Amino acid sequence: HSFLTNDELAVLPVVKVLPSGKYTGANLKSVIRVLRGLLDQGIPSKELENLQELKPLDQCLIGQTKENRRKNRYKNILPYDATRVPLGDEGGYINASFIKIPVGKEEFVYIACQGPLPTTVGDFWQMIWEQKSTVIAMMTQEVEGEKIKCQRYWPNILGKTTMVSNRLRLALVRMQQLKGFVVRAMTLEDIQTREVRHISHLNFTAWPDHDTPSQPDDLLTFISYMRHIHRSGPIITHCSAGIGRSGTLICIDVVLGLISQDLDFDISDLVRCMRLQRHGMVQTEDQYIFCYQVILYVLTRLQAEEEQ
């Protein structure tokens, strides 16, 4: 098929525009006024301050065992035991957590995890196969500056298959470079059953660790594309630690989904919900403020189109 075009992307809705409701006309202006008011008074910063006071779901015991410690990129960034993603019938360990958020009549399901280590590449793909995910949102570059953020866990040569585990064969069939992100098409096969799955790997590269996107419009396009291609299964969202950029992505994705169904949203409640499933989601004050800024931005664009 054709390479992704900008036109194809521009038509993809960031939010579903409704005839009326909370986000049209006078009501939309009122929401914009409120959001601007909150940012102007530094409310988001205060909300985050309160959220960092939220106690952990559990002690993350499994990720701390001597046999597992080595499977963590960061010794202190661990999945809770209660919501961890298990590997195989044996319940093997991987630094990954299920994060589910009700979004009106829909439910957004993610697996937020750390970027795979050279020694957990097989584990990662096992998880993707077992959890039936076909969409991966990698919100980090492999290396940023002089720092390693995530080891490449796919073949870098087009068409060459490789066994990432005893049962799973992985191949890179296509790579496309867009503004701010990369789209890679991969095939994942259980050579025993011969079942072949098509994995869409979305790599947003214009978002530095502990920072905010350098290209907000491109992130919105990225999100609308991720939403558009997702058919079923949890969406894998990872970065380096699996909490900052992934949490910010989830928050925005969810708020846009709420707006699309003419529903209210509360960013603090949303981040609190995420943090009770994987500790630390949305890492910095600026990332939390960014959630507010980009939604305000989306709403102002909506208003601009409305006065078409």
Swiss-Prot record:
Chain sites annotated for binding substrate: 209, 239-245, 283
Documented effect of changing residue 289 to V: No effect on substrate affinity
Tissue: Expressed in keratinocytes (at protein level). Present in most tissues with the exception of the liver and skeletal muscle. Most abundant in lung, kidney and fetal brain.
Residue positions of the active site: 239 (phosphocysteine intermediate)
Localization: Cytoplasm, Cytoskeleton; Nucleus; Cell projection, Lamellipodium
Transmembrane segments: none
Domain of life: Eukaryota
Chain positions covered by the region annotation Substrate: 239-245
Domain (Tyrosine-protein phosphatase): residue spans on this chain: 44-298
Phenotype when changing residue 305 to D: No effect on substrate affinity
Family as reported in the entry's similarity comment: Belongs to the protein-tyrosine phosphatase family. Non-receptor class subfamily.
Function: Tyrosine phosphatase which negatively regulates FAS-induced apoptosis and NGFR-mediated pro-apoptotic signaling. May regulate phosphoinositide 3-kinase (PI3K) signaling through dephosphorylation of PIK3R2.
Assembly notes: Interacts (via the first PDZ domain) with PLEKHA1 and PLEKHA2. Interacts (via the second PDZ domain) with TNFRSF6 (Fas receptor) (via C-terminus). Interacts (via the second PDZ domain) with TRIP6 (via the third LIM domain and C-terminus). Interacts (via the third PDZ domain) with NGFR (via C-terminal SVP motif) and PKN2 (via C-terminus). Interacts (via the second or fourth PDZ domains) with PDLIM4 (via C-terminus only or via combined C-terminus and LIM domain, but not LIM domain only). Found in a complex with PDLIM4 and TRIP6.
Protein name in the entry: Tyrosine-protein phosphatase non-receptor type 13
Organism the protein comes from: Homo sapiens
Full-sequence portion shown in this chain: 2170 to 2477 of 2485
